Design a protein around this ligand. Structure first.
Ligand code: 2CT
Ligand code: 2CT
Ligand code: CL
Ligand code: CL
Ligand code: CL
Ligand code: CL
Ligand code: MG
Ligand code: MG
Ligand code: MG
Ligand code: MG
Ligand code: MG
Ligand code: MG
Lengths: 229, 229
């Protein structure tokens, strides 16, 4: 439904929807913009990520509440039916994002900052699919997340400095994937520790604003390490 | 889309959606339940009010942000177009609620607690329509809100004690209608003061739990009076 709206107008409206905290609208404007077929700039990539993170984040929090209620009830079919409806809507949002990345954001992304950003996003949305998946397509979804994260880590370690915020946020989310999804808490702790230590040694190269950006994400790595150890 | 679901299952799902903070779902479940055609109980009336208050409250806050941005811009048509889209969606939610009340909740409501609750709701949703209305259908929408509120106040003063929470909340919202919509700050202050004073004189008749319920709303009346005087 956005094919008749100018790209620039979709971007402008996504920024208005963010101000208004209208995240489903923001995602629909940014999906529209991606579907224009042009590569996205840094600012536009961040608008796309912020919109979908907030939409799926609402769905994941609801699914958690419902899942907890369902597990306590284990009445009639209602809790299961409504948890299933929220789960399906979550899956649909993840499949939309994964489809934007496959058609055709990743294949057109040649620069490291864009290619790492989109492969981190692919890891993240398969990770949200894994949180609700049961059994053995669960395995295949977990390996798709791990593969995306690993491709992004390999490019990031060749092409970005250790304090780059996209590299830091990738490592943060890959560490969370290992602790919460892959049942690999030692890998999670090793990754978050190595990432933190390599960033700290590179901080001296930064300006004051870059230092603020990097140390913000380093504090997230530290906060997980405190929770995990 | 809820015609195939049991009434009891719609109520149960509205309570689950409230726990999950899924207010659009909660409203759609309660609309479904109303459309079964049976009168609603006290608890069910409160579920209907909580769902729509949260849905329209999100829309009103977004419309405020957008309207402020638009008034500052007075670029191209985008801010106006997106404010109009949020305004239209707000109007649609209000028209849905008003339609449930007209078809046929109010006409079947014979007891004072139900009839006052639904006429307060009718006042409230015409009040939200008035906040976004421009000119002379604006006048007619303001008079519809005032008429509904006045009918509810007349029943409430005949049939409920001055500390009844529905009577208090009606008077609170009618006072806000006079201050913010009707440009009648003196009427607003007179109503909120008379209501507060008549409730205070009736508190001695209450149990401890009823006293907690009434004094909570009295504090809201006091908070407005502090803001207005
Ligand atoms: C509204 O946004 C929501 C909603 C629900 C949520 O949990 C349900 C979360 N998650 C968090 O708050 C913390 O997650 C972290 C922490 C560090 C790195 C990556 C992540 P994530 O798992 O990609 O979000 C966010
Ligand atoms: C999310 O819920 C929202 C969203 C946006 C809001 O303003 C935009 C409000 N309003 C308020 O917080 C205070 O309003 C009062 C105060 C006293 C009596 C009646 C009302 P109301 O005007 O019926 O709500 C609530
Ligand atoms: Cl359902
Ligand atoms: Cl390429
Ligand atoms: Cl629009
Ligand atoms: Cl009747
Ligand atoms: Mg064009
Ligand atoms: Mg390219
Ligand atoms: Mg510890
Ligand atoms: Mg039946
Ligand atoms: Mg009746
Ligand atoms: Mg004062």
């Amino acid at each position: 439904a956005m094919g008749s709206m100018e790209r620039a107008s979709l971007i402008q409206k996504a920024k208005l929807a963010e101000q208004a905290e209208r995240y489903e609208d923001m995602a629909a404007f940014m999906k529209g913009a991606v579907e224009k077929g042009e590569e996205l700039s840094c600012e536009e990539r961040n608008l796309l990520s912020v919109a979908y993170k907030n939409v799926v984040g609402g769905q994941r929090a609801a699914w958690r509440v419902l899942s907890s209620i369902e597990q306590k009830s284990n009445k009639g079919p209602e809790v299961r039916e409504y948890r299933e409806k929220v789960e399906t809507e979550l899956q649909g949002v993840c499949d939309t994002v994964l489809g934007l990345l496959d058609s055709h954001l990743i294949k057109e992304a040649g620069d490291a900052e864009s290619r790492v950003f989109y492969l981190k996003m692919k890891g993240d949305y398969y990770r949200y699919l894994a949180e609700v998946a049961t059994g053995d397509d669960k395995k295949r979804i977990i390996d798709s997340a791990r593969s995306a994260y690993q491709e992004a880590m390999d490019i990031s370690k060749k092409e970005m400095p250790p304090t780059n915020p996209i590299r830091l946020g990738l490592a943060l989310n890959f560490s969370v994937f290992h602790y919460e999804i892959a049942n690999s808490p030692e890998e999670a702790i090793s990754l978050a520790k190595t990432t933190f230590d390599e960033a700290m040694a590179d901080l001296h190269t930064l300006s004051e604003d870059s230092y603020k950006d990097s140390t913000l994400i380093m504090q997230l790595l530290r906060d997980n390490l405190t929770l995990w150890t």
